[PDB]
């Protein structure tokens, strides 16, 4: 449930989670289809699963 951002991701709404390359994100929900939910720096939202790598 711990992943590291491979790329920057810029949220397009407040359902989505922004992060920078190298940020550590904690996965809160795994679904298939290319989107996971996670939390970073007190915010929770969805992000592309192929934008991160498991630690």
């Amino acid at each position: 449930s711990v992943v590291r951002a491979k790329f920057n991701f810029q949220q397009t709404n407040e359902d989505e989670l922004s992060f920078s390359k190298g940020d550590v994100i904690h996965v809160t929900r795994v679904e298939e289809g290319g989107w996971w939910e996670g939390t970073h720096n007190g915010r929770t939202g969805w992000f592309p699963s192929n934008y991160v790598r498991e630690i």
Partner: peptide, 16 residues
């Protein structure tokens, strides 16, 4: 507490 729905849009491609 209510959680955000999974995006309906397709996941974006990784930056090239």
């Amino acid at each position: 507490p209510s959680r955000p729905p999974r995006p309906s849009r397709p996941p974006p491609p990784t930056p090239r």
